[PDB]
Amino acid sequence: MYKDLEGKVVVITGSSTGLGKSMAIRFATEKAKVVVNYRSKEDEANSVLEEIKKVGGEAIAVKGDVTVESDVINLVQSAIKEFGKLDVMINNAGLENPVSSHEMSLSDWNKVIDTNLTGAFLGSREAIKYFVENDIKGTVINMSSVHEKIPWPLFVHYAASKGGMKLMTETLALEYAPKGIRVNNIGPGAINTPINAEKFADPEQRADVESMIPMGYIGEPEEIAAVAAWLASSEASYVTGITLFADGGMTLYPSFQAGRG
Amino acid sequence: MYKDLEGKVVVITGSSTGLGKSMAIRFATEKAKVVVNYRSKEDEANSVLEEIKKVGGEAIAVKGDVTVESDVINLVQSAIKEFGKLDVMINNAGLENPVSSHEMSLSDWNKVIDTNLTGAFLGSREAIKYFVENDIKGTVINMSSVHEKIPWPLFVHYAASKGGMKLMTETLALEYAPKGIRVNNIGPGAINTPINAEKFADPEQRADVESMIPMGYIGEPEEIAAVAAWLASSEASYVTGITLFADGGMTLYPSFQAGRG
Amino acid sequence: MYKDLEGKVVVITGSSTGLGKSMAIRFATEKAKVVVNYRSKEDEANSVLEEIKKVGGEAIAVKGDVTVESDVINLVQSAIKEFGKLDVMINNAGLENPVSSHEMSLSDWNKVIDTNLTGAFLGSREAIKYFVENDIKGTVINMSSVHEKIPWPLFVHYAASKGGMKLMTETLALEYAPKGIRVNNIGPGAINTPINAEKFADPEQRADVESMIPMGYIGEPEEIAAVAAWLASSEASYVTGITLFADGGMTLYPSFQAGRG
Amino acid sequence: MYKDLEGKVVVITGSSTGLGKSMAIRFATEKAKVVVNYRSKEDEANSVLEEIKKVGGEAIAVKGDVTVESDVINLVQSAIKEFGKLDVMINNAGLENPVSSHEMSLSDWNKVIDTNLTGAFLGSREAIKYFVENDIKGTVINMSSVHEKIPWPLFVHYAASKGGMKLMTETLALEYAPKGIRVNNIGPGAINTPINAEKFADPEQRADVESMIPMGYIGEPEEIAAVAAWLASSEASYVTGITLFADGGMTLYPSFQAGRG
């Protein structure tokens, strides 16, 4: 669809499953060279790799924990060594777990902040460092959430991590705009991925979530991959520092439908 | 680029010049059927019509003042009568003029509110009324500005009209999301159109505006048309109620570059 | 409570009932001189006047329709003629009525825009014109709503009017900040006033609204008057261009409590 | 000024200097019992303690590093042991240092995130845990910055920490609103404190900062303490989850004055 993506090198963290996997496949379909990332389970990575070969794409899988600095540095260097360059960096790895805020341990809080926010900072830092030192007008796409805007009781660490990601992205976008480096956030609503399989399995829970989505349906991973592909393309040449929400209307305050209140 | 746009009927208000004209040409290139709109004479409309024929597109021009209810109703009906249906409604007509707020006449205030806000409401209302009565999952795209967010001294009427447009769009998006009708805003920054030709003609004024754009350059109309085409396509199927800023970073607070403050 | 408010002249539009009335009484208690405004029913005005005399305050009532330019001009001039000066202008008059957006008449749309937005512009314009011509560091407080942020199906005209008010206020705040003129918005959530008496009368409707308020209760007019008094005082000397929401948490997305979604 | 603050117990982190010190003195003047906090030595704390005695207030100083969990837990317990209860928790400690984002070490990033964000989480958690277990309708005030909204090149860690603080505060506000616990942010612009003494010492730097403030002057600590006192009082009974900016108009986009752009 986007001719300018052909030959571009795209790195995606946490891309052995869910949204990361869907984006890896979409970029492969756009003829971009993809670097998949797995934390520990290499088998899941080989799976995404087979889907990519299925569409005639070219890709490699690199092990790396985004909370380990040397792993992030190595991930970026691996892309350059294998494909000769780096064009798009997508920080997608993340985690979440529910705990009442006043009962949340420092350990749980740090795990989420370290992975969701600091991990994205490291990925962004390494990609931009490369872009700057080589005069490349690359782009960084950070995977956020409707929760960088919508508060989330029981997930205060997650909400804080995404709210922080918003300001990190806007700051990097402003700081490097003069060099032609675009930095944007994608803010997905409820999407059908493994992180929600069990929740969406229960008919009561599923109906509950759907009631919070104005459009009435839980989105598919491909609907988010479509956003990532567009933002990475030259079609979005004048777009930087934004958060593009793809949430079926979640951020519009679903409880106020029908003129309630 | 977007195969799903082929055969879609797109109506664009104030499309005989500037952004409206560029969008008309882009949609024609996507093989959509376009309805161009001019306020009084049709010479400016003939240029766009010729540009559309040049790319093998199909289009018609309809006279209509967006501040006149019957004109807006007729504009929508003309699309249906000529092409048999309506798929995308783009409210783009607008005007602006500088006046110190405490010296602004009610006449100037009303002219801008009537055209920029009420005109968009009328266009949105008529398109949605049609979509609802015919079970069509159409879309409405409203042309806003970075000024639905960035205050604008000397243009208080314009800022108010776009701030109002933001809430109008988000309300319509929430209200009709259950019916599959998407409503979104595009927020352009400084773009090279006739409304800025004189301003950008002066080397001092041009450099002044460029200093307020982090990316360092004034955008081209095609960069905004690219956004409209994507938002109208099924690629943005899960996107509704948002304002997609295409401003080279204007909303990121340009005065804070280099860690100032 | 605020010693600096003693002797200040405060004008409040639509202050014969509800929030306007409560603010009139609160300012009288702060020893400010108040100018009450009624559109037609003078009897309601005399009532507020009696409450003010009850607290030993000084006030006058002036007839005026905020949609009539000469009435707004006269309202401001009356304050100056009676008390010799003007210090605080509060644009509070407003109206709302539910109608599905695609069925809303231009007449209903205009009535709300004219009263809620244009009326506030006129009041703001006249107050600021006076402040500027007399080197007075006055303040303007505009009564908004959580709906300058929260979309409102069935009330698209109201939402647009408040969204417009937000940008109008921020623009005026930026434009006149150098002259020491502060302009701020107050954004009330659901408050117990006559405009909601019937709605809150029904046990089912009342419980429905309360479910949308995190704090669990519908606010009282005095809780909003407290905000107005503080914003008008020198305690808020460095505060301008903001919208202070007093909504029990409505803008925090009530549907997401308990980690839902 | 606020009679309801008499006898209330207020804990303020990092209150031996700057804004924390000013707030400690203001609350003492409101007859509240204050718990001052210093990181290592206590000389700076003794100054505040003497200022508090000067106004006839009652206070104690407690050593504590907000990045050390046991220190935060002890700080809260010390207030309860000394004064018998806790009513207001103010997380004010913070730090910042400039470094180009692509050159920022993980060490610098973590130091700021740990202190500014995680430290505030710990303070909020301990205060709320106490409030919940004792059915106390207490309040938490978190010291943010205009930079939870305005991006800040060279201070990406600071911006991320405050953006994260915004979502943390809004989440806690929503989560505990049903229990009557209010949680709000104060967002100061440029204020005259020791953290800016050197910067504001230079005539060129000072004039540079003032040019980014619409009101034209750098705020004083007392102007921020005024906001904290009001938010803690019952006057703000219906206010929760907001960020009250006290910035002289900084968030209004200063570069757009005079209708530029």
Ligand SMILES: NC(=O)c1ccc[n+]([C@@H]2O[C@H](COP(=O)([O-])OP(=O)(O)OC[C@H]3O[C@@H](n4cnc5c(N)ncnc54)[C@H](O)[C@@H]3O)[C@@H](O)[C@H]2O)c1
């Ligand atoms: N699924 C949704 O509805 C939804 C909504 C909003 C935001 N998101 C965000 O989108 C991203 C993708 O989520 P998803 O649904 O595909 O979830 P997912 O769990 O399937 O994908 C996240 C991936 O991150 C990897 N990962 C976690 N910690 C890592 C670490 N330290 N190092 C390396 N890899 C690590 C996981 O192994 C996993 O494959 C996440 O950042 C998530 O917060 C998802």
Ligand SMILES: NC(=O)c1ccc[n+]([C@@H]2O[C@H](COP(=O)([O-])OP(=O)(O)OC[C@H]3O[C@@H](n4cnc5c(N)ncnc54)[C@H](O)[C@@H]3O)[C@@H](O)[C@H]2O)c1
């Ligand atoms: N050019 C920019 O930099 C910029 C930035 C932000 C927003 N916008 C918005 O984008 C839209 C397009 O602006 P543009 O630059 O192409 O300006 P433009 O003046 O070239 O286009 C606006 C068109 O609206 C038409 N129009 C005005 N009033 C009308 C009425 N009552 N009925 C019918 N047609 C009417 C005009 O004749 C004109 O062709 C406007 O809404 C504008 O506010 C433009």
Ligand SMILES: NC(=O)c1ccc[n+]([C@@H]2O[C@H](COP(=O)([O-])OP(=O)(O)OC[C@H]3O[C@@H](n4cnc5c(N)ncnc54)[C@H](O)[C@@H]3O)[C@@H](O)[C@H]2O)c1
């Ligand atoms: N009550 C709430 O819950 C709530 C929530 C958000 C916002 N508000 C806003 O606060 C303001 C006060 O609302 P309220 O609850 O006291 O309602 P209200 O109806 O009691 O007060 C509004 C007043 O405006 C007057 N008014 C209307 N049109 C006028 C005109 N053209 N000229 C002069 N006066 C006119 C009315 O006569 C009335 O006394 C309104 O702007 C409203 O939109 C109220």
Ligand SMILES: NC(=O)c1ccc[n+]([C@@H]2O[C@H](COP(=O)([O-])OP(=O)(O)OC[C@H]3O[C@@H](n4cnc5c(N)ncnc54)[C@H](O)[C@@H]3O)[C@@H](O)[C@H]2O)c1
């Ligand atoms: N001064 C401003 O213009 C301005 C603008 C926006 C925000 N703020 C914020 O307001 C707060 C107050 O800033 P300030 O100007 O008074 O600065 P400051 O440096 O004078 O005060 C911060 C205090 O935090 C203490 N502190 C730092 N790390 C600590 C730790 N780990 N444990 C305990 N105490 C620690 C410091 O010793 C210091 O006394 C900060 O959070 C700052 O980010 C200040």
